[PDB]
């Protein structure tokens, strides 16, 4: 069901949370080789999460589930904010700009924490 597809998508999201926090520790410790690998892992996880979210939104639309579509449109918009900040973080790492990397890292944490009540609302709505 779309609800079980959302729980699978939520688990991929939690995997990125786990990898992100390990990456933050590696960045603080200066282990740039680890950071590079974690950033590649995160890019793959976010790409997967995005695709799963789009399929869920499209299914909710085909089902006529207006409330779930509304929430998923809001949630996918916030997802793109996080993705843009993530991409900027990756660029800051490539460029060696640790100040910008720190900035974007905190921003990605706040954007993600803000979107959590909505994430839970969607599970109930589908
Ligand atoms: O739900 C997600 O795909 C997600 C959450 C998150 C938090 C920090 C960095 C990357 C992230 O991806």
Do the beta carbons of residue 72 and residue 60 sit within 8 Å? yes
Residues in the chain: 126
Structural domain total, the chain:
1
Name the residue with the closest Cα to ligand 1, atom 9: 20
Please work out, in degrees rounded to the nearest 5, the angle formed at the alpha carbon of residue 24 by the alpha carbons of 44 and 39: 20
- Reported resolution, Å: 1.5
Pocket test for ligand 1, best of 112, 113, 115 (most atoms within 8 A of CB): 112
Buried b (16+ CB within 10 A) or exposed e, 36-75: eebbebbeebbeebbebbeebbebbeeeebeebbebbeeb
2: domain range? 1-126
Please give the structure tokens belonging to residue 123: 């599970």
Q: Enumerate residues lining ligand 1, CB below 6 A.
A: 13, 16-17, 20, 42, 46, 49, 82, 86, 108, 112
Q: Compute the distance between CA of residue 38 and CA of residue 92 in angstroms, rounded to an integer.
A: 15
Q: Compute the distance between CA of residue 48 and CA of residue 45 in angstroms, rounded to an integer.
A: 5
> How does DSSP assign 62-122, residue by residue?
HTT-HHHHHHHHHHHHHHHHHHHHHHHHHHHHHHT-HHHHHHHHHHHHHHHHHTHHHHHHH
């Amino acid at each position: 069901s779309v609800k079980s597809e959302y729980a699978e998508a939520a688990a991929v999201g939690q995997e990125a949370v786990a990898v992100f926090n390990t990456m933050k520790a590696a960045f603080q410790n200066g282990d740039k080789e680890a950071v590079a690998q974690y950033l590649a892992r995160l890019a793959s996880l976010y790409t997967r999460h995005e695709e799963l979210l789009n399929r869920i939104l499209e299914k909710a639309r085909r089902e006529g589930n207006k409330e779930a579509v509304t929430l998923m449109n809001e949630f996918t918009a916030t997802f793109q904010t996080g993705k843009s900040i993530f991409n900027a973080m990756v660029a800051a790492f490539k460029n060696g700009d640790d100040d910008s990397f720190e900035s974007y890292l905190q921003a990605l944490e706040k954007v993600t924490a803000k979107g959590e009540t909505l994430a839970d609302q969607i599970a109930k709505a589908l």
